[PDB]
Amino acid sequence: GVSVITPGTNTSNQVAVLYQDVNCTEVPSNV
Amino acid sequence: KFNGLTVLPPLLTDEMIAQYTSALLAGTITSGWTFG
Ligand SMILES: *[C@@H]1O[C@H](CO)[C@@H](O)[C@H](O)[C@H]1NC(C)=O
Ligand SMILES: *[C@@H]1O[C@H](CO)[C@@H](O)[C@H](O)[C@H]1NC(C)=O
């Protein structure tokens, strides 16, 4: 699955993304 | 590791929960019921 982490649109529009139990070398900065 | 089925990990690890119980146990051996 894919989850989106947001501080709330009333604070910022930046976002982080969690790819659940996926090895981070096969996803397609901060990784 | 199946077809559409996944298992999510718990937020507290087992190390964290053992830390919590050792803090409770050191509170009671040493202060009685005053820390609660
Ligand atoms: C939400 O927005 C209102 C007005 O724009 C502001 O007063 C409030 O503090 C905001 N909430 C947060 C959690 O930033
Ligand atoms: C992802 O794959 C690399 C290449 O084999 C491996 O070194 C790494 O340990 C893997 N990720 C995890 C969390 O084990």
Side-chain angles (χ1 to χ4, degrees), chain B:
Chain B
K1 228 168 313 169
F2 265 134
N3 41 73
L5 307 189
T6 197
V7 168
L8 306 151
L11 173 65
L12 295 178
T13 61
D14 277 313
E15 236 221 17
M16 295 177 157
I17 292 160
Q19 247 198 289
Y20 270 131
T21 74
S22 64
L24 295 150
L25 227 163
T28 184
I29 281 172
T30 244
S31 300
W33 58 100
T34 60
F35 74 110

Side-chain angles (χ1 to χ4, degrees), chain A residues 2-31:
Chain A
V2 177
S3 308
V4 171
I5 296 95
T6 162
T9 34
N10 189 16
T11 290
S12 170
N13 283 252
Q14 310 183 64
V15 131
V17 177
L18 176 76
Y19 294 85
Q20 305 196 61
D21 76 314
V22 170
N23 197 359
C24 195
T25 83
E26 65 214 10
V27 167
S29 177
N30 305 127
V31 306

